Amino acid sequence: SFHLDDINWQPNIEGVYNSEQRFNLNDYFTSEKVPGDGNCFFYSVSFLLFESLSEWRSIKNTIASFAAANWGQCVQAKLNYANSSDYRADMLRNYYWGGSVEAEILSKALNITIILWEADVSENVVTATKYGPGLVSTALNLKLCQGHIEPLQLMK
């Protein structure tokens, strides 16, 4: 649109919002490069919270604590795993690929909003999914492109 914070988000009853808006990410966001291994979701979240990659494992620990105490709120994780114990053992391993399951949990665990912007190779939004009630400008904006996750920041 004209302002990212004026996008129209459509919630489902699970509290996940979707947006059909289609624009080019790089007209509104600066991208940042993180190393392209299987930890990139966690590198990206760490970059946006701390301006450093070094906190990526502790973000996993925060997710794990939420999954242990609040498994019934881990809606997407419950589709993929029989119990919180199985989930935590898998997610905590190196090169576990983060995605919507972790975005949903982290948004609740840290009281932040996380947006997964699925992009094609030319950086056009294909799907946008927002976890949490907040606005684009306050969210952790993640670009999902060609199997890798990179942090985005609002331009200027």
Residue numbers in the entry: 3 to 158
From the paper:
One specific mechanism used by nairoviruses is the production of a deubiquitinating enzyme, termed the vOTU, that disrupts the innate immune response. Interestingly, the nairoviral L segment also encodes a viral homologue of the ovarian tumor protease (OTU) at the N-terminus. Instead, the vOTU’s primary function appears to be the reversal of post-translational modifications by ubiquitin (Ub) and the Ub-like protein interferon stimulated gene product 15 (ISG15). Each vOTU possesses a seven-stranded beta sheet as the core feature, with five major alpha helices framing the rest of the structure.
The vOTUs from DGKV, QYBV, and TAGV readily crystallized and were solved to 1.62 Å, 1.65 Å, and 2.05 Å, respectively. DGKV vOTU, consistent with its low Ub-AMC activity, possesses very low activity for the di-Ub FRET substrates, regardless of the linkage. In DGKV vOTU, aspartate is replaced by a glutamate that alters the spatial dynamics of the catalytic triad, possibly contributing to a less rigid structure that allows the histidine to adopt the alternate conformation. While atypical for the vOTUs, it does not appear to be the cause of DGKV’s low DUB activity, as mutating the glutamate to an aspartate only further diminished activity. In DGKV vOTU, Trp73 packs with the methylene group of Ser86 on one side and the aliphatic portion of Lys80’s side chain on the other. Lys80 itself is stabilized in this permissive conformation by hydrogen bond pairing with the carbonyl of Gly74. In DGKV vOTU, Gln78 within the selectivity helix is central to the interaction, pairing with both Ser102 and Tyr133 by hydrogen bonding. In contrast, the DGKV and QYBV vOTUs possess more polar residues, including asparagine, glutamate, and threonine for DGKV and glutamine and lysine in QYBV. Interestingly, changing the pocket in DGKV vOTU failed to improve activity. This suggests that some vOTUs lacking any outright DUB activity may have evolved to a degree that prevents the generation of this activity through simple changes to better accommodate Leu8 in Ub.
